[PDB]
Amino acid sequence: TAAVGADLLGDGRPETLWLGIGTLLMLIGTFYFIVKGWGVTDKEAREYYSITILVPGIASAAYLSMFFGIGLTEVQVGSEMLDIYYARYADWLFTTPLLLLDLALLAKVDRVSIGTLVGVDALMIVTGLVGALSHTPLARYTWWLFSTICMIVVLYFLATSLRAAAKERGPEVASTFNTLTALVLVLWTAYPILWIIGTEGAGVVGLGIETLLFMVLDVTAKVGFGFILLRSRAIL
Amino acid sequence: TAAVGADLLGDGRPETLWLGIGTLLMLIGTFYFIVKGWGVTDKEAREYYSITILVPGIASAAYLSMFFGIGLTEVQVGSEMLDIYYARYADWLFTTPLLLLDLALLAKVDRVSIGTLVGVDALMIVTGLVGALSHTPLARYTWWLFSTICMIVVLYFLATSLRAAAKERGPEVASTFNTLTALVLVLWTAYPILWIIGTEGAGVVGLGIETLLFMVLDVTAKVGFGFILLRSRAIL
Numbered sequence: 253t254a255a256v257g258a259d260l261l262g263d264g265r266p267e268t269l270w271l272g273i274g275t276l277l278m279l280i281g282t283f284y285f286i287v288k289g290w291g292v293t294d295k296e297a298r299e300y301y302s303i304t305i306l307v308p309g310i311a312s313a314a315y316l317s318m319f320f321g322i323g324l325t326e327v328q329v330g331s332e333m334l335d336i337y338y339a340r341y342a343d344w345l346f347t348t349p350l351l352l353l354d355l356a357l358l359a360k361v362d363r364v365s366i367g368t369l370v371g372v373d374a375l376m377i378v379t380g381l382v383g384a385l386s387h388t389p390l391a392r393y394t395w396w397l398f399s400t401i402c403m404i405v406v407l408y409f410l411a412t413s414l415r416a417a418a419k420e421r422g423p424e425v426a427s428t429f430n431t432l433t434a435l436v437l438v439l440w441t442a443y444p445i446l447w448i449i450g451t452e453g454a455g456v457v458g459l460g461i462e463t464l465l466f467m468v469l470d471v472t473a474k475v476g477f478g479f480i481l482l483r484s485r486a487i488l
Numbered sequence: 489t490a491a492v493g494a495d496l497l498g499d500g501r502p503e504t505l506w507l508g509i510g511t512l513l514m515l516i517g518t519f520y521f522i523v524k525g526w527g528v529t530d531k532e533a534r535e536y537y538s539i540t541i542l543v544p545g546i547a548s549a550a551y552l553s554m555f556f557g558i559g560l561t562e563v564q565v566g567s568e569m570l571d572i573y574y575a576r577y578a579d580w581l582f583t584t585p586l587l588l589l590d591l592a593l594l595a596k597v598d599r600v601s602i603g604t605l606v607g608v609d610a611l612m613i614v615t616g617l618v619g620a621l622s623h624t625p626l627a628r629y630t631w632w633l634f635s636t637i638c639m640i641v642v643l644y645f646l647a648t649s650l651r652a653a654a655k656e657r658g659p660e661v662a663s664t665f666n667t668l669t670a671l672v673l674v675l676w677t678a679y680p681i682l683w684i685i686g687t688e689g690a691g692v693v694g695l696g697i698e699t700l701l702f703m704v705l706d707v708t709a710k711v712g713f714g715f716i717l718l719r720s721r722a723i724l
C-alpha cells in the first residue's frame with residue numbers, strides 16, 4: 253500500500269509525478285516534431301506532419317490539466333468515491349482519430365472508410381468515458397465491454413482492410429504501415445486491460461502505477477508512433 | 489494482497505477504521521480511569537491515576553487526530569510515497585515517559601534515574617521519528633537501529649536497576665511492578681519489529697493491518713497496563 257510517484261504539488265495525489273513527466277515528454281516530442289517540421293516541402297509529408305503533430309500536442313494539453321488537477325472528479329459508486337480523470341478521454345477523443353488518420357491516409361482509403369474508422373474509434377473513447385462514469389458496477393463492466401468491442405472492430409479494420417491497401421502500395425509503405433500497425437495492435441489493446449484492473453475497474457492496481465503505466469503507453473503510442481512514422485519514406 | 493479496515497471517511501484511507509476503534513477504546517479506558525479515579529481519599533494512588541490517566545488521554549487525542557488525517561505526512565523515499573502518521577510519535581513522546589514514570593514511582597528512585605530513564609526513552613522516540621521522515625532507505629534503517637538500541641537501554645534499566653530497587657520494597661509492590669515490567673517488555677519490543685515490516689520500513693505488511701496491530705499494542709500497552717496498576721494494592 254505504498255504509492256509510487258510523488259506529490260509534487262502537495263494536492264494529496266502522488267501521481268502528479270508521473271503526470272508531470274508525461275507533460276514534459278509530450279511537449280518535447282511535440283516540439284521535436286515541429287522542429288523537423290521546418291525542413292519539409294512535400295505536400296504529402298507536410299500533411300502527415302500536420303496530423304501527427306497535433307497528437308503529441310493535444311496530449312500535452314491534456315497532461316498539463318491533469319497535473320494541475322483540472323480534469324479530475326469523483327464518481328460515487330457503491331460506497332467508495334473513485335477518482336476519475338476525464339481529461340484523458342478528451343485527450344483520447346481526438347488523439348486516436350488523428351493517430352488513426354495517419355494510417356488511413358497512409359493506406360489511402362475512401363472518405364467513407366476513414367469516416368467509419370473515426371466514427372467507431374470515437375464511439376470507443378466516448379463509451380469508455382461513459383464507463384468511467386457509470387454508477388452501477390455491472391454498467392461499468394458493460395460499457396467497458398462495448399467500448400472494447402469497438403476497440404477490436406477498429407483494430408480489426410487496421411489489420412485487414414487497411415493492411416491490404418497499404419500492401420497494395422509499395423513495400424516501403426507496407427513495411428512502415430504494418431510496423432506502426434503492429435505497435436498500435438499492442439499498446440492500444442493494453443489500455444482496456446489496465447483500465448479494467450485499475451481504479452476505474454477492479455482497483456487491484458493503485459492510481460500511481462496506473463497513471464505511470466498509462467503515461468508510458470501514451471508517450472509510446474503517440475511520440476513513438478510518430479517517430480516511426482515521420483521517419484519512414486512512406487510519408488513521401 | 490487486499491487491505492483490512494474501511495474507508496470511514498472516503499478519503500482513500502481504510503486504516504481510519506482501526507484509528508477509529510482506537511480512539512473509541514482509548515477514551516473508554518481514559519474516562520474509565522477518571523470515573524474510578526475520584527473517590528480516592530488517598531494521596532499516593534491519586535498521584536498514580538493523575539499520571540496513568542493522561543496516557544490513554546493523550547493517545548485518544550492522537551488517534552482522533554490521525555483519524556481525521558491530522559498527524560499524517562507524506563515521506564518521500566525513492567520512487568515511492570509513504571503515508572507516515574507522525575502523530576504516533578508525538579503521542580509516544582508523552583505517553584511513554586509517563587507510562588515509564590509510573591513504574592519509577594512504583595520503585596521510588598532518585599531523579600537522576602528517572603531523568604535518565606525518560607531521557608533515553610525520549611531519545612528513543614524522537615529518533616524513531618527521524619527515521620520515519622528519512623528519505624534514504626539506509627538512513628531510515630539506521631535511525632531505526634539507534635532507536636532500537638535505546639529501547640534496550642530503557643528496557644535494560646527497567647529489568648535491573650529498577651526491577652531490584654522495587655524488590656527491596658514490598659513484595660506486593662514487587663509482585664505488581666514485576667508484572668508491569670513483564671508486559672512492558674513484551675509489548676514495547678513488538679513496536680520496532682512492526683515498524684520494520686510495516687510501511688515505515690520493509691513494507692511487507694500493509695498500513696491497514698499495521699494500524700490495527702499498532703492500535704492493539706497501544707490499547708494494551710496503555711489501558712491494559714494502567715488497569716493492572718490501578719487495580720493493584722501496590723499503588724497505596
Ligand SMILES: *C/C=C(C)/C=C/C=C(C)/C=C/C1=C(C)CCCC1(C)C
Pocket residue numbers: 344347348351376377380381383396399400401403440441443444447470473474
Ligand atoms: C494517445 C492515446 C491512445 C493511442 C489511446 C488509445 C486508447 C484506447 C485504445 C482506449 C481503449 C478503452 C477501452 C477499449 C475500454 C475502456 C476504456 C478505454 C477508453 C481505456
Ligand SMILES: *C/C=C(C)/C=C/C=C(C)/C=C/C1=C(C)CCCC1(C)C
Pocket residue numbers: 580583584587612613616617619631632633635636637639675676677679680683706709710
Ligand atoms: C503507549 C505507547 C507505547 C507503550 C509505545 C512504545 C513504543 C516503542 C517501544 C517504540 C519503539 C520504536 C523503535 C525501537 C524504533 C522505530 C520507531 C519506534 C518509535 C516505533
